[PDB]
From a paper:
PARP-1 participates in multiple cellular processes, most notably DNA damage repair, transcriptional regulation, and cell death signaling. PARP-1 has a low level of basal catalytic activity that is highly stimulated up to 1000-fold by DNA strand breaks. Using x-ray crystallography, binding studies, catalytic activity assays, and HXMS, we find that the autoinhibitory HD of PARP-1 selectively restricts access to the NAD+-binding site and provides a dynamic structure that can regulate the frequency of NAD+ binding and utilization events. PARP-1 interaction with DNA strand breaks leads to full NAD+ access to the catalytic active site, whereas PARP-1 alone has low frequency NAD+ access that accounts for the basal level of unstimulated PARP-1 activity.
In BAD, carbon replaces the nitrogen atom in the nicotinamide ring, thus making a benzamide moiety, which is a poor leaving group. We determined the x-ray crystal structure of the non-hydrolyzable NAD+ analog BAD in complex with the constitutively active CAT ΔHD, thus providing the most comprehensive view to date of PARP-1 active site interactions. The structure was determined by molecular replacement with diffraction data extending to 2.3 Å. The asymmetric unit contains four CAT ΔHD molecules (A, B, C, and D). Each CAT ΔHD molecule has BAD bound in the active site. BAD adopts two conformations in molecules A, B, and D, with each conformation at a similar level of partial occupancy around 50%. Molecule C exhibits a single conformation of BAD. The benzamide riboside moiety and the adenine riboside (adenosine) moiety adopt similar conformations and form the same interactions with PARP-1 in all BAD molecules, whereas the positions of the two phosphate groups vary somewhat and account for the different BAD conformations. Alignment of the CAT ΔHD/BAD structure with the structure of CAT WT indicates that the HD in its folded conformation would clash with bound BAD/NAD+. In particular, residues E763, D766, and D770 are positioned to interfere with the binding site of the adenine base and the phosphate groups of NAD+, suggesting a potential mechanism to block substrate binding.
Numbering used by the authors: 765 to 780, 789 to 1010
The structure:
């Protein structure tokens, strides 16, 4: 195999022959350099946005992969000029990552239950790494998870304070944001390319009337997501 060993390690983890399985992902996977500015930014985002409710474990970044799915840049082109683009977390089971990288993040099928959703059938993201990391479903006997960083074109956000059955957005709105009691410090936001990265440490949002601990972000069109990084995370349980 021509591929770097961290990429090979990643392919074995995703599938349960290396170069043929890499081809099935339809994704270009580079290893982000550990000393680069990108890696420093990504590690800061992981360190700063680990919440106090989720103190069962600490997170260690093992490998950072830059990912470019085939045709996704072209699919995302209409939304790339849209304002309020953000780099946000999406966690999932390791078993879903073959489908995720080959097909992109999808909205759960019509057959999935509408009742288990805070804000309807969309694609959910967090600005707190520990919120999304819980959706890895890692365990003491299987303590390595995968987590995405997506560029999400949020546009005008419909900002809600409680769970709502959203089937359609108000005119001019492109996404929903559930407002949490705690938020990454908005004065600590940085810009990586044209994308906002909410990597400040947690503070009180000053939104008193809300039932969510942390923010979440939902989009209802799959083309509003451009996947950027895949992190292999070690969960150190307390
Ligand atoms: N996941 C998060 O990081 C996250 C962030 C903020 C907030 C939330 C919170 O989760 C709640 C929703 O969870 P639930 O799994 O019930 O719903 P839902 O998100 O629709 O489940 C579908 C699963 O299918 C995965 N997948 C997507 N594309 C593909 C694909 N091509 N191939 C295969 N699998 C794919 C996806 O990752 C997910 O695990 C929601 O109500 C909200 O409270 C999560």
């Amino acid at each position: 195999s021509k591929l770097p060993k961290p990429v090979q390690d990643l392919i074995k983890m995703i599938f349960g022959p290396i170069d043929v399985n890499y081809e099935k992902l339809k994704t270009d996977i580079k290893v982000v350099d550990r000393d680069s500015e990108e890696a420093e930014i990504i590690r800061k985002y992981v360190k700063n946005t680990h919440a106090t409710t989720h103190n069962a474990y600490d997170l260690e970044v093992i490998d950072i992969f830059k990912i470019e799915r085939e045709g996704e840049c072209q699919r995302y082109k209409p939304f790339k000029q849209l304002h309020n683009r953000r780099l946000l977390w999406h966690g999932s089971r390791t078993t879903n990552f073959a489908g995720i990288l080959s097909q992109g993040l999808r909205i759960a099928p019509p057959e999935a239950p509408v009742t288990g959703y805070m804000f309807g059938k969309g694609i959910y993201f967090a600005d707190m790494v520990s919120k999304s990391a819980n959706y890895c479903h890692t365990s003491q006997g299987d303590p390595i998870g995968l987590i995405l960083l997506g560029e999400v074109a949020l546009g005008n956000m419909y900002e809600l304070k409680h769970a709502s059955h959203i089937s359609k957005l108000p005119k001019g709105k492109h996404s929903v944001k559930g407002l949490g009691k705690t938020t990454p410090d908005p004065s600590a936001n940085i810009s990586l390319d044209g994308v906002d990265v909410p990597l400040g440490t947690g503070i009180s949002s000053g939104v008193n009337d809300t039932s969510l601990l942390y923010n979440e972000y939902i989009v209802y069109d799959i083309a509003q997501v451009n996947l950027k990084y895949l992190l292999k995370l070690k969960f150190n349980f307390k």
